[PDB]
Every structure is written in structure tokens, then in C-alpha cells.
């Protein structure tokens, strides 16, 4: 076998573009394991997938919505590798210092 | 892994569905790698009906011959078997004093 139900109850906002079809896959695994996408940015979302640098208008969503989660799309890729619901932090995204350097 | 058995294939959801079926169907395409389309356009395989035959599908069958009108019991019976089952056991026709 049955499909899995590790995202059940959790919300999910893809934040903007990702390479390929990777905007899909991320829709399709969302999907199978029973997590719901949302079309905006409303009160019900709770992880914000995102392969971007950190946007500064993610500090108004969380005006809105302080239990915001902001994460890699890696988080999803390996949920189904492993095929449990693991922790979102270990993908997390913050914000950077100003001129940052690489590493 | 996820069974990819509804690759390459594109669906419409046409008409009204029972409780919560739609987001079932919606979860089980997606999940076997199906494609929803938004409209029954010229990309469209298989619309998926609770439904009746409707007039709207001979309509339909005009420009897009190919077409197959098929019950959400195909897409729960691939889910239950995990495997591509034939669309034709489950197929919606008009009913025979109609021919």
C-alpha cells in the first residue's frame, strides 16, 4: 504493498523553480504519501520546499505564520528513499550573513 | 519504490465525485506517475467518470477519437492490484436501448 501515509496532515508550499522535472517529482511524492500541497501561501501551510536562496519576503509569511518550516527539497527525495517521515531540520533553510562566504 | 505504471498516460477528472474520491483518484494518478490535465483537451486519454454516459462525450469524441471514458473502480483496482489493468473492464457506455 500500500502506498505510505508518513505526510499525512502535513502542508506543503513549493516555493518557486526547480531544475528539470523536479517540480513534479516533488508534487508526485508529496502526493503519494498523503501530504497536502497548497496553492498559496495561506494559514494551513507548515514546510516551504525551496531550492532557492533564502528570500527576504519569508520574514512577512512568518508574520503570518510563525510555525513556518523552510526546507531542501532533499528532505522529500530522502523521505521516500527511506520511505519514513524524517526530520525536517536536517534540510533546513535559513538566512545568510550579508556577503557570506563560500564553504 | 513508487510503481510507475501510469507514465505517459493523461487523465481528466470529469464531473462531480462521492466524499472524498477526487482527491483519492487525484492521489493515486499522481503517485503512479500519471498526468491531470486542468481540461478534457486533444492531450487527455482517459476521463474518469462517476458519472453517466453524457452528451458532452460524444461532443468530445469529435476531435479526439481516441478518447476512453472510464470508472474511478479501474484506478482503485491498478492501486489494489499495483499493476496497469485494462481500462475496457471498467469502461462507461452509453446503455444499449440508447444505440
Redesign the interface.
Known amino acids: 504493498?500500500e502506498?505510505p501515509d508518513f505526510f499525512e496532515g502535513k502542508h506543503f508550499f513549493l516555493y518557486g523553480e526547480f531544475p528539470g522535472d523536479e517540480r513534479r517529482r516533488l508534487?508526485?511524492?508529496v502526493?503519494?504519501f498523503?501530504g497536502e500541497l497548497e496553492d498559496y501561501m495561506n494559514e494551513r501551510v507548515q514546510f516551504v520546499i525551496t531550492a532557492q536562496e533564502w528570500d527576504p519576503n519569508f520574514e512577512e509569511a512568518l508574520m503570518e505564520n510563525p510555525s513556518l518550516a523552510f526546507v531542501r527539497p532533499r528532505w522529500i527525495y530522502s523521505c521516500?528513499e527511506k520511505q519514513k517521515l524524517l526530520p525536517h531540520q536536517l534540510y533546513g533553510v535559513v538566512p545568510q550573513a550579508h556577503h557570506h562566504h563560500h564553504h
Do not use: D, H
Open positions: 504493498p502506498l508534487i508526485r511524492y502526493t503519494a498523503n521516500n
